[PDB]
């Protein structure tokens, strides 16, 4: 095993200054075809390695001119004439001259900045979500990690749409925003109040500090209203049955699926019959959440058998009993026909 050692372990430069990195191999890297397969790689933090130099000194396509490699035999150097902000990471040498191929131990290159700035301001909103009633007074709060005086705005965003400014400078209502919105607070703690909730106020609400760059937003508060209406009308399920695909039969298992689509109320019974013999204990049910828009439910029932058992029987049926059906509905298939 050719061992590749690198020096230094790590180095720091001020932005735009040069850096030099060295690689030492335990044996000569000269291949018998007189090529020297020494390569250099950069691995930016959290990313894949990327190839910079091959055969000691050649740049790959698109590699900037500020990277150069030199050396011969057992001693190799990579020079970075100017370390730019996107050049930071771990540099590795590697050899492709003798099996097993090996890589160096890595040299970390970082930028040392003497000035340390104030940290980014963090905005934290409370609660994360809430469910309320039309007519309620609703208050949500925002806490800033630094004192931001009154430089705080509130936004409303509905799914699929852009945010909309509601309040700026902690308490000023923007033009066109209804007067039921108001804001208060100063320093680190801010409040958005909706004086009397209306159905169109369902949305996520965000605060944003406007005091110091970078401008930062809170993580959002979701405001929900659960509907206070009657039940929807009875909806009969439409029923579909699916034989196992021939793909799945190639796996020794057969799943038969029965679909009950868009029914109301929730109570429904599904029985499976194989060759008109009622089944029990070999099917599983799964139900959607009540649909957001038409308030129906949907249901799948899956019957599982071995391929051997599936091929011994002819007719597969699911029988559905539901209040919206005048009598139980049967959907079936006969194995082998189309």
């Amino acid at each position: 095993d050719i061992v590749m050692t690198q020096t230094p372990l790590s180095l720091s430069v001020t932005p735009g200054q040069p850096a030099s990195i060295s690689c030492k191999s335990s044996q000569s890297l000269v291949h018998n075809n007189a090529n020297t397969y020494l390569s250099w790689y950069l691995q930016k933090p959290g990313q894949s390695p990327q190839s910079l130099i091959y055969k000691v000194s050649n740049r790959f396509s698109g590699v900037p001119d500020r990277f150069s490699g030199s050396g011969s035999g057992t001693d190799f150097t990579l020079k970075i004439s100017r370390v730019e902000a996107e050049d930071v990471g771990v540099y590795y040498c590697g050899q492709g001259t003798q099996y097993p191929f090996t890589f160096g131990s890595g040299t970390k290159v970082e930028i040392k900045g003497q000035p340390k700035a104030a940290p980014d301001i963090q905005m934290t909103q409370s609660p994360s979500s809430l469910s309320a009633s039309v007519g309620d007074r609703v208050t949500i709060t925002c806490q800033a990690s630094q004192n931001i005086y009154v430089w705080l705005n509130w936004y409303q965003q509905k799914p699929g749409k852009a945010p909309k400014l509601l309040i700026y400078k902690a308490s000023n209502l923007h033009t066109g925003v209804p007067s039921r919105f108001s804001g208060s607070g100063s320093g680190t703690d801010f409040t958005l109040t909706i004086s009397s909730l209306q159905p169109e106020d369902i949305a996520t609400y965000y605060c944003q500090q406007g005091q110091t760059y970078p401008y930062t937003f809170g993580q959002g508060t979701k405001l929900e209203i659960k509907t206070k209406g009657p039940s929807r009308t009875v909806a009969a399920p439409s029923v579909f049955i699916f034989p196992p695909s021939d793909e799945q039969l190639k796996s020794g298992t057969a799943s038969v699926v029965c679909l009950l689509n868009n029914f109301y109320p929730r109570e429904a019974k599904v029985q499976w019959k194989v060759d008109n013999a009622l089944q029990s204990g070999n099917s599983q049910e799964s139900v959607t959440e009540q649909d957001s828009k038409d308030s129906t439910y949907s249901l799948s029932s899956t019957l599982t058998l071995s391929k051997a058992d599936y091929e011994k029987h002819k007719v597969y049926a699911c029988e559905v009993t539901h209040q919206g059906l005048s009598s139980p509905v049967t959907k079936s298939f006969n194995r082998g026909e189309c």
């Binding site: 097993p100 090996t102 890595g106 936004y155 700026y168 937003f217 689509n261 139900v287």
Partner: protein
């Protein structure tokens, strides 16, 4: 009517750059700050930077200095945002927004946003597979190659234990070298590297796994001759651990429509852990879709169905494909669902 009208949705490859535009109308473009703000899907808002069109003074968030460029064309009242060296986590809706007169610290008018998707599939090398495996058991990785002549390259697997250096795993040569293979000593007899040139795919079969095999695994493709390259994939983590149930990617079977309204779907079976995400026609088809909650089977693996109702008129013309993503196993599966033809 004060408005900001944005350029259309864009799909871009990682490492490339994107430039989105924002046309101002109904107010004097040069007297108000313009900002750009982005929203990654499911998440909150992030300020990118600002520009005052009257004197093109700019301010950037530090994490975007050197990578974002804000520019303007005042003759057509348009602002532009260019973002370079795009990665995974730059997928987002990008908004341009205008500040209230006389200040730059609020966002008064908003564009409707531009969807920018950094494609996962437009890279030279992308690995599939990974996750948790019991010591002594097996796991298979694959790697899809694009944008170079796969068959001429010598392919490698390289791995990196957390916090450690790169370590070479295996190499497989091309057809002119009989697809000869070479291994690191610690994996000889346990790992097998292979390739399938007709599918531009590289494979690593790992058996008898040990705790020391825990690492991010990278596929890699190398060629010298007269236009050399040394490409690296994205890396996938393999954790050899006995303290967590093992991950398993799903199998996907079609629920073909029967022979008014038609129903069809995908049976997504035999995966662990949760979740999978299911889409239809890459997200183009959403109405009438029901993806049921997963149920844990007696095998210890989850199964679910995703179904869609369509008019039976469409079973001839329309193509129906369910797209299944299982992040814990780093696997994606597309299954075309077509009417069974006799």
């Amino acid at each position: 009517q004060v408005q900001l009208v944005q350029s259309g949705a864009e799909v871009v490859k990682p490492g490339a750059s994107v430039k989105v535009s924002c046309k101002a109308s109904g107010y004097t473009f040069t007297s108000y700050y313009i900002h750009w703000v982005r929203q990654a899907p499911g998440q909150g808002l992030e300020w990118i930077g600002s520009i005052y069109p009257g004197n093109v003074n700019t301010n950037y968030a530090q994490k975007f200095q050197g990578r974002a460029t804000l520019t303007v064309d005042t003759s057509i009242s348009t602002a532009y945002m260019e973002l370079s060296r795009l990665r995974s986590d730059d997928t987002a809706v990008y908004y341009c927004t205008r500040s209230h007169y006389g200040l730059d610290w609020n966002f008064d008018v908003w564009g409707k946003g531009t969807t920018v998707t950094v494609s996962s599939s437009q890279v030279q090398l992308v690995e599939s597979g990974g996750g948790v495996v019991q010591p002594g058991r097996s796991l298979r990785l694959s790697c899809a190659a694009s944008g170079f002549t796969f068959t001429k390259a010598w392919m490698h697997w390289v791995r990196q234990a957390p916090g450690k250096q790169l370590e070479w795993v295996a190499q497989i040569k091309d057809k002119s070298n009989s697809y000869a293979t070479y291994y690191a000593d610690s994996v000889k007899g346990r790992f097998t590297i292979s390739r399938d040139d007709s599918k531009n795919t590289l494979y690593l079969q790992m058996n008898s796994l040990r705790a020391e095999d825990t690492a991010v695994y990278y596929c890699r493709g190398v060629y010298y001759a007269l236009s050399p390259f040394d490409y690296w994939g994205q890396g996938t983590l393999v954790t050899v651990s006995s303290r967590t149930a093992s991950t398993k990617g799903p199998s996907v079977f079609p629920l073909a429509p029967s022979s008014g309204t038609a129903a069809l779907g995908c049976l997504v079976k035999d995966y662990f852990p949760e979740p999978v995400t299911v889409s239809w026609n890459s997200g183009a088809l959403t109405s009438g879709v029901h993806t049921f909650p997963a149920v844990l089977q007696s095998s210890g693996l989850y199964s679910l169905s995703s179904v869609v109702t369509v008019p039976s008129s469409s079973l001839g013309t329309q193509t129906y494909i369910c797209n299944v993503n299982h992040k814990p196993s780093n696997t994606k599966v597309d299954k075309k669902v077509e009417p069974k033809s006799c």
